[PDB]
Design a protein around this nucleic acid. Sequence first.
DNA 1: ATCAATATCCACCTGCAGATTCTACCAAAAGTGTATTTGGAAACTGCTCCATCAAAAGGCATGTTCAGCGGAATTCCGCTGAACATGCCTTTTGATGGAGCAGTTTCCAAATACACTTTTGGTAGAATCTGCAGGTGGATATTGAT
DNA 2: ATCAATATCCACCTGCAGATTCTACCAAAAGTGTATTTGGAAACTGCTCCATCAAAAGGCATGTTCAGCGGAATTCCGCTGAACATGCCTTTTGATGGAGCAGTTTCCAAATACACTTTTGGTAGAATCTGCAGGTGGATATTGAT
Lengths: 97, 97, 98, 84, 81, 93, 96
Amino acid sequence: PHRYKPGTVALREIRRFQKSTELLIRKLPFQRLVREIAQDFKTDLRFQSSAIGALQESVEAYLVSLFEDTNLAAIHAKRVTIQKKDIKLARRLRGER
Amino acid sequence: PHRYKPGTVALREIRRFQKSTELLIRKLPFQRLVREIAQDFKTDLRFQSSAIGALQESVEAYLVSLFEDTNLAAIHAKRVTIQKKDIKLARRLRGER
Amino acid sequence: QSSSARAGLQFPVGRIKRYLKRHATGRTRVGSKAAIYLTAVLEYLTAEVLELAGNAAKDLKVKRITPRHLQLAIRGDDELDSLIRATIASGGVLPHIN
Amino acid sequence: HRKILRDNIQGITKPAIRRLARRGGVKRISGLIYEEVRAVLKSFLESVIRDSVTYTEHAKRKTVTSLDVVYALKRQGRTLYGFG
Amino acid sequence: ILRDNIQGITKPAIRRLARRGGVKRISGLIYEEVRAVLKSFLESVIRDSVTYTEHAKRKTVTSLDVVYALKRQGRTLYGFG
Amino acid sequence: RKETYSSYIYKVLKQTHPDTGISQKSMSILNSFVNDIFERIATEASKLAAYNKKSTISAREIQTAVRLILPGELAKHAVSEGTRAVTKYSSST
Amino acid sequence: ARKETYSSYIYKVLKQTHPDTGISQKSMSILNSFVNDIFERIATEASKLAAYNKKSTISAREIQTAVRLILPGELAKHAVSEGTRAVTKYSSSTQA
DNA sequence: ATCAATATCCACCTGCAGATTCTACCAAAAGTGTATTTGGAAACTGCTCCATCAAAAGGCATGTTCAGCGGAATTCCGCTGAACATGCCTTTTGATGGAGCAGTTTCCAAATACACTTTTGGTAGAATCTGCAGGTGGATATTGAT
DNA sequence: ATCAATATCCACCTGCAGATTCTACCAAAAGTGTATTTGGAAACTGCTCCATCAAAAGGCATGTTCAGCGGAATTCCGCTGAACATGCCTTTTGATGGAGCAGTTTCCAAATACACTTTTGGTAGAATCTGCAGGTGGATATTGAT
């Protein structure tokens, strides 16, 4: 059988996301979760649907900013994975509370 | 002449300066600095003392911010010196320009 | 009779009337909500300047000098996110280490 | 009627977080990036829903638009483009 | 007089100026990149300094105008005039 | 115009504990934050009451301004005395 | 059922810069959001520095200053070149 | 387990500039008091765009399974804190001095609020024609135990 | 060095929904006489503050050595993440109701703008403690060598 290295999912999945800019996170569970975090401050809110699209690509943009900086902060320290000190230094340098 | 171990004397000089709040760079050095960087790209113009004092205040505050979080980025890599790759990773996490 | 006292509390309202007029956009602004700009400025300046009483045992010094107010504005984590990129003239840093 | 609905807060999961995570670029993951990407999407999304729906309610309005959340994203300083 | 000299060779002040925050043992070669980063920051603040001065139409500089510029670049060194 | 706030700063520091003193130079710091967060709440109040295109600026938009920028704890007790003092103007006729 | 829109002038200037291409609706919305927020920040600092100069009316020198201080140097030299060129053209308001 | 010149802290005295608290003082917004007009607020009511039901496929999960590799670890030199010594570049204190600027007045381009009307610019249908998504076919480079 | 097995690249065929001229239309408007009133342009100038500028002196920066100690090359050796069948669940879309939003019309109430009169909140200054910076000084921790 044909088989090639665990860990060499890298470059083919690199192009496999990179050609397409469709929204990564699956939609209506994400609707459920934003509905649930919103639902416990004030009543009877709805969403407009393109507002869900807006907050969806907002979390997409902020997450890709997050682990792009943890990616190069991981390679800052001769390291091949990301781990918890990497994301914690990202959340040091974030500047936003 | 008895002077013991280096390195924790670095710590008492650490606390020595950051107790104090003296304007830490030297005056006519920044004077000639800011003239001879201003006069070239736009022509001969004149300064005022409080304005130039405030602008090296800006210079001090910005660069002390960048080297303290440069220190945090350096001690990410389990290491106690300060080296250049820490600095440019600090500049890049700080919003490249 | 007097507008700060017909209001009652201790900020002036008559200048922030026209200081809002100085800055406004909407071609119309109300003549009765000076009563909240003074409340805003009362609350935020007291909610910084009363904390300056925490100088006492750490300074035993009677005026509120320029490093010292930031030297206690830092540990107000509820405060530092209101002067975020803002920074002092000659203020110092709250010290710490590794 | 009461709309009692509990956790979807883990609801996007290890393939979902790894597909967003490699979409950002990183190609080697460690076995506990569950909970921190959890907590940080908690933080960011409660910030945006707080400011957005609070001044949506300022608009006398109990029903959110999209222009309110994009004005909140620019209010936060992360101005999204192109939904109006 | 107006002649160009090199104040980029500022002073080695960073071996006390990095002694403002918790810089441990230093190990050097930072002098040239601390030189580069502070020259970038000073040129960034000084071009909009002179920008308001040509909008000031008088050939001095001043402090209220420098704090106008200083917050409009975002790096608002607060509180001097 | 020559116009400051530092006297009202001094009256405030007296209606604290009156034992301390306003220092020589921090009152400029106090002036600079009172006018800059004054101006930025004025900016956001301007355009937030401009998005519903209502002509004046008034009570509802100001309490939503002074909640929608300043963070949680001081915001909610801030708006508590905001409502307090604005009733306290209307406390008399 | 009544809305000011930006897209019309946008597509005519797109077809005149480059001749032969097509557009798309969400891309129409991203560049009209771009044009109104770049107007938004030039306008805000235009009012701000026509306030702090203690001068009373908005002026072309003031907004040439404004466009210099907001956008970086490459499009600074561009935008000032056609700022002066546009004011040369509309200033030249003759019978012919 | 023990020593001790350096460093810091706690206390005293002084001088010095400076806060501050006046009192004047003055002068110029500001509270009062008119009336006008028009926006804020509420009633209502059609008409979306929200909300909830139910049917079938793809990504999800998950144990199995296997290896780059993380952290530790040992060592090995080079490079930097550190201490000292000295030039040197400040450093301040007057001192000059002079030339742009804040204020000043004037005076006129011109902005604005009128009425006022031919156009364009927005919307909305529509239709259409075509550009792209997807399907699928099929050459073509890369490669992994051999 | 090497073929299948992907993997990807083109690439042609076809659907299929959608941008895009096209009409229109229409309704609110951008350009227009215009009177006029004011703030921008621009001369005059007191005048201060800002650039030089030297001399005593003095911290302190700059070169020196130097010597441990920590960055880093290398090992290795346990171990914890990646592929991968292989089930399966929750989706992914498609089709039904209704609270509740534009948008209306209409009323009244607060804010504009006018004159008013003063008083309070801006300076000048001044003087006087006076706090406090800066010294001294007397006592008290301190960590490498032994």
